């Protein structure tokens, strides 16, 4: 009666894991390695297609992680190795024009370094932050001396994130979820197909996500398992919170030759007096932001459940403070002033003190270290807080604390709406057609 008819070019796909490539259009991410982005990328709406998405089981996130690590490391390959710098260092306190809150923050240190000629030595001095030196038992050493060689970042290279568009290879496609309020794990009733994702900026931070996407209408709370205290909660925002960060000191940068073709950069001195690095947010905006967060948490934890916010504690600065790169400098800000409230049913700012660190161990690895050269002058940046990383502790009161660690979650947030599938164009169906 019926025969097997073969069709090719059939709109069928299966979930798949493949390799994606970057298309983007003096840079940490070596963007010249990517193809350029097509000025007229396409997107198509797929009416009546409902697909299951799972942001917590997504290999796009893992590839983004891998690419960022590799690109970051590759940019340090041609840079100076400051092995001549790991010497007994002789240090005293900077006590000249010190704000009370920086008493013994900054230190003055003396070295016997190598020079252009191997038979000579050059006596130099520089200023260091306390966070990067450890006492010898006036004798100090750099903190990386007992774990790794440190590479100086090349000064011409910018650390400012540039949006990277991820594109599927031929035969594959990326599905995108357009469903408002999608939490990342259920069926998505409204999808579209794209070849490339939007450009995603590889912004690196802890606790407070910066310069990401906003929700259209309401705060969306996403988690792998909300009742599991071992999982993080990613909260997006439907409004930005403006944050103004500064390093309010006019630093004068000096450099020396340490060997043929190699030079070391350091802070020589500071012009004028000093002030503690800090970040400002508006108190009122922050209070509205939390009010929205609390309402959504109550939907999940109970209408009459008390929601409390608290500072996090335990671990290194990367998981207790808000770290970020501002002006190319590395900041560690105390967010306790933001997360200190209990909720039952005009230029007033919140000021968060911050510290500055130059020896940076990224991606929670050991054995690698980078020396961040100082930046001349005074640093300011303004950024938008577009989501929070919270963890729940553990009756009556639920306590949430800022979370952090595992960079996969920052990327997971931007990629929550994308899925990779493979096209299977060949298939069969019964018809009345024979031979």
């Amino acid at each position: 009666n019926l025969w097997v008819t073969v069709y090719y070019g059939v709109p069928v796909w299966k979930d798949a894991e493949t390799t994606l490539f970057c298309a983007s259009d003096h840079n940490v991410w070596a963007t010249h390695c990517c193809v350029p982005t097509d000025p007229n990328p396409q997107e198509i709406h797929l009416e009546n297609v409902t697909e299951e998405f799972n942001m917590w089981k997504n290999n796009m996130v893992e590839q983004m992680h891998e690419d960022i690590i590799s690109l970051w490391d590759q940019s340090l390959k041609p840079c100076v190795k400051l092995t001549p710098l790991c010497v007994t260092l002789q240090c005293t306190n900077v006590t000249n024009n010190i704000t009370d809150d920086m008493r013994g923050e900054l230190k003055n240190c003396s070295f016997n370094m190598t020079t252009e000629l191997r038979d000579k030595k050059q006596k130099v001095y520089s200023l260091f932050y306390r966070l990067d030196v450890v006492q010898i038992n006036k004798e100090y050493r750099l903190i990386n001396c007992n774990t790794s060689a440190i590479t100086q970042a090349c000064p011409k290279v910018s650390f400012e994130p540039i949006p990277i568009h991820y594109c599927a290879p031929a035969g594959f496609a990326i599905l995108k979820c357009k469903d408002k309020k999608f939490n990342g794990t259920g069926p998505c009733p409204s999808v579209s197909t794209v070849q490339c994702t939007h450009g995603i900026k590889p912004v690196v931070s802890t606790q407070l996500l910066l310069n990401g996407s906003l929700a259209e209408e309401e705060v969306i709370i996403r988690s792998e398992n909300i009742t599991n205290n071992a999982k993080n909660i990613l909260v997006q925002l439907n409004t930005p919170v403006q944050i103004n960060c500064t390093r309010p000191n006019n630093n004068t940068v000096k450099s020396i030759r340490i060997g043929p073709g190699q030079w070391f950069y350091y802070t020589g001195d500071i012009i004028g007096d000093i002030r503690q690095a800090h970040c400002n947010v508006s108190k009122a905006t922050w209070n509205e932001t939390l009010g929205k967060v609390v309402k959504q948490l109550r939907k999940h934890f109970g209408n009459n459940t008390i929601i409390r916010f608290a500072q996090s504690s335990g671990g290194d600065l990367e998981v207790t403070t808000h770290s970020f790169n501002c002006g190319g400098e590395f900041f560690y800000c105390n967010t306790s002033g933001l997360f200190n409230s209990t909720w039952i049913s005009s230029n007033d700012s919140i000021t968060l003190p911050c510290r500055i660190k130059q020896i940076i161990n990224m991606w929670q690895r050991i054995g690698q270290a980078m020396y961040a050269p100082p930046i001349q002058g005074v640093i300011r940046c303004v950024s938008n807080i577009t989501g929070l990383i919270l963890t729940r502790d553990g009756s009556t009161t639920e306590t949430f604390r800022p979370g952090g660690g595992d960079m996969r979650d920052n990327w997971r947030s931007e990629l929550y709406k994308y899925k990779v599938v493979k096209i299977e164009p060949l298939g069969v169906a019964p018809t009345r057609c024979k031979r």
Partner: protein
């Protein structure tokens, strides 16, 4: 006129009228390697589909009819249900357990068919 996978969700008999729109998109420092491997892989998948159509005697056709009868054990629906209500994604899931059987039958059918033609051209 939609484009690429935009026909998904339409009925099977509607989607089947636009096959070329997707056929055209097939084939269209390890950052060098990732890009190169992707190109090779795209070719390999393309060629496996084409080889398979070749074995079955469907090379170059898009829509190809055969001599293998449809089994009610693979699926049993009215043709109007299959072509007017169901879409291709649903269908692929429904008969995903019979594709190996069907492909084996198509390959056997074409091999016998070729032998019969060779004999006829020799005048039996």
């Amino acid at each position: 006129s939609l484009g690429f996978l935009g026909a998904a969700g339409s009925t099977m008999g509607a989607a089947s009228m636009t096959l070329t729109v997707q056929a055209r998109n097939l084939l269209s420092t390890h950052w060098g390697i990732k890009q190169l491997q992707a190109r090779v892989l795209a070719v390999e998948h393309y060629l496996r589909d084409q080889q398979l159509l070749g074995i079955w005697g469907c090379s170059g056709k898009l829509i190809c009819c055969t001599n293998v009868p449809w089994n009610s054990s693979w699926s049993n629906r009215n043709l109007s249900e299959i072509w007017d209500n169901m879409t291709w994604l649903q269908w692929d899931k429904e008969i995903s357990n019979y594709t190996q059987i069907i492909y084996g039958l198509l390959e056997e059918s074409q091999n016998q068919q070729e032998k019969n033609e060779q004999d006829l051209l020799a005048l039996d």
